[PDB]
Design an enzyme around this catalytic site. Structure first.
Site, PDB file in Angstrom:
ATOM      1  CB  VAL A   1      -0.392  -0.126   0.883  1.00 16.37           C
ATOM      2  CG1 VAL A   1      -1.711   1.138   1.183  1.00 16.37           C
ATOM      3  CG2 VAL A   1      -1.604  -1.229   1.207  1.00 16.37           C
TER       4      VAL A   1
ATOM      5  CE  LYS B   1      -6.617   5.349  -7.303  1.00 16.83           C
ATOM      6  NZ  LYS B   1      -5.312   5.897  -7.154  1.00 16.83           N
TER       7      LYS B   1
ATOM      8  CB  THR C   1     -13.150  -9.129 -19.808  1.00 18.44           C
ATOM      9  OG1 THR C   1     -13.107  -8.818 -18.383  1.00 18.44           O
ATOM     10  CG2 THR C   1     -12.061  -8.631 -21.098  1.00 18.44           C
TER      11      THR C   1
ATOM     12  CB  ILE D   1     -13.536 -13.458 -23.355  1.00 12.44           C
ATOM     13  CG1 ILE D   1     -14.448 -14.031 -24.323  1.00 12.44           C
ATOM     14  CG2 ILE D   1     -13.807 -11.649 -24.191  1.00 12.44           C
ATOM     15  CD1 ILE D   1     -15.741 -13.702 -24.800  1.00 12.44           C
TER      16      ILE D   1
ATOM     17  NE  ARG E   1     -18.269 -18.513  -3.626  1.00 14.81           N
ATOM     18  CZ  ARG E   1     -17.125 -18.189  -3.672  1.00 14.81           C
ATOM     19  NH1 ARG E   1     -16.237 -17.374  -5.178  1.00 14.81           N
ATOM     20  NH2 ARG E   1     -15.988 -19.286  -3.042  1.00 14.81           N
TER      21      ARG E   1
ATOM     22  N   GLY F   1     -15.272 -21.823  -6.804  1.00 16.18           N
ATOM     23  CA  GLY F   1     -15.560 -21.052  -7.825  1.00 16.18           C
ATOM     24  C   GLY F   1     -15.068 -22.392  -8.918  1.00 16.18           C
ATOM     25  CG  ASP F   2     -11.674 -24.282 -10.314  1.00 14.04           C
ATOM     26  OD1 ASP F   2     -11.774 -24.223  -9.265  1.00 14.04           O
ATOM     27  OD2 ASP F   2     -11.447 -23.572 -11.262  1.00 14.04           O
TER      28      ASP F   2
END
Ligand SMILES: Nc1ccn([C@H]2C[C@H](O)[C@@H](COP(=O)(O)NP(=O)(O)OP(=O)(O)O)O2)c(=O)n1
Ligand SMILES: [Mn+2]
Ligand SMILES: [Mn+2]
Ligand code: NA
Ligand code: NA
Length: 326
Positions: free
Chosen positions: A56, A63, A92, A97, A140, A180-181
């Site tokens: 950081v 920000k 994407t 992609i 998920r 996720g998989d």
DNA sequence: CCGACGTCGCATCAGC
DNA sequence: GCTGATGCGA
DNA sequence: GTCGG
């Protein structure tokens, strides 16, 4: 989830730089910043407080001060409002992609889900499968479903050859209550760093899984790595399970520990550990840990008999899989 | 400051 | 066809 | 975008 707002902002900025700007190192910088804040055990009250953390710096600190004060980031507000960025960012999200294809598609006036379906002829095979299961791949996988999937994979692999060992890695091995998989590490005594005594070792396993209609589609497939699609069987009158991403990795049996270390992750944990390894004068991949010679060239593989041995070489206290979720 | 930033597999393309 | 670079992904 | 040396 103390600093979820901040980590979400940084993740969105990372995705912007990766997908739109095509600046992968900015993407990594934000990925890293998001990771170190994610595991920071205090609710962050200023950018200065955040700047103390490694990764950081000034810009992100600035920000964070804007976000804390307003609940927004004008930079992100603009990106959101922008035609082209938003279209490229969305495209994407289709597997296969990336930034390059997404920007090329948008140039041609292909910028929506509808446009993709209308232009399926313009997709390579991976992208077509990715489009087909766009909806499903958004969902998920509950760990309970992961356990069912594990049972099928391990049993079907057993049926092919009882000397196979299949190990589910990734977020599952890290104890995630959802994934996720599914990632499967595969070994067989016939395939070592010394020789490959049987052909089609991965193929036979994939083929079997296709035969029982577990694996439904193929994204990519080589001698040691498979990327594809699978689905749990449903019961009578049951709505079908979502189709799921699965990838399988055949690792030389004598190199299991580097393999399972790699495939367990997380991706950022792997980067942190490999960076640290370099600092300590070693290099680590999914196969070996090698000492770095005094001119920086990798030397012979070091003996490895456990995951912990790799941790020991680079002078890290061993960390259980569930503490590698960085 | 400023080069360097984790390591590799499979699909595809460029050049020959 | 091969070799190497690029795209996308683990 | 960040940072070590
Ligand atoms: N950039 C990457 C992506 C993945 N990997 C390794 C570490 C990951 O834990 C493992 C599996 O990749 P993955 O399936 O994309 N992510 P992972 O299983 O950690 O979490 P999920 O999003 O699948 O729940 O591959 C890596 O070393 N470098
Ligand atoms: Mn995974
Ligand atoms: Mn995966
Ligand atoms: Na810092
Ligand atoms: Na994609």
């Amino acid at each position: 989830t103390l600093n979820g707002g901040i980590t979400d902002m940084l993740t969105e900025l990372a995705n912007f730089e990766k997908n739109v700007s095509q600046a992968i190192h900015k993407y990594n910088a934000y990925r890293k910043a998001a990771s170190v804040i994610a595991k920071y055990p205090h609710k962050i009250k200023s950018g200065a407080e955040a700047k103390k953390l490694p990764g950081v710096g000034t810009k992100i600190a600035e920000k964070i001060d804007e976000f804390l004060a307003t609940g927004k980031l004008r930079k992100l507000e603009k990106i959101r409002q922008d035609d082209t960025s938003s279209s490229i960012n969305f495209l994407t999200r289709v597997s296969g992609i990336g930034p390059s294809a997404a920007r090329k598609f948008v140039d041609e006036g292909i910028k929506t889900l509808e446009d993709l379906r209308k232009n399926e002829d313009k997709l390579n095979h991976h992208q077509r499968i990715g489009l087909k299961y766009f909806g499903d791949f958004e969902k998920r996988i509950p760990r309970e479903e992961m356990l069912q999937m594990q049972d099928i994979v391990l049993n079907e692999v057993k049926k092919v050859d009882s000397e196979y060992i299949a190990t589910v890695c990734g977020s599952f091995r890290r104890g995630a209550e959802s994934s996720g998989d599914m990632d499967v590490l595969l070994t067989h005594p016939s395939f070592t760093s010394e020789s490959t005594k049987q052909p089609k070792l991965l193929h036979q396993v994939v083929e079997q899984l296709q035969k029982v209609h577990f694996i439904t589609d193929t994204l990519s497939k080589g001698e040691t790595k498979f990327m594809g699609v699978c689905q749990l069987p449903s019961k009578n009158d049951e709505k079908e399970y979502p189709h799921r991403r699965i990838d399988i990795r055949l690792i030389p049996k004598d190199q299991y520990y580097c393999g399972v270390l790699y495939f367990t992750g997380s991706d950022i944990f792997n980067k942190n550990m490999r960076a640290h390894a370099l600092e300590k004068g070693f290099t680590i991949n999914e196969y070996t840990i090698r000492p770095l010679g005094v001119t920086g060239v990798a030397g012979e593989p070091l003996p490895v008999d456990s995951e912990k041995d790799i941790f020991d070489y680079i002078q890290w206290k061993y960390r259980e899989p569930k503490d590698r979720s960085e």
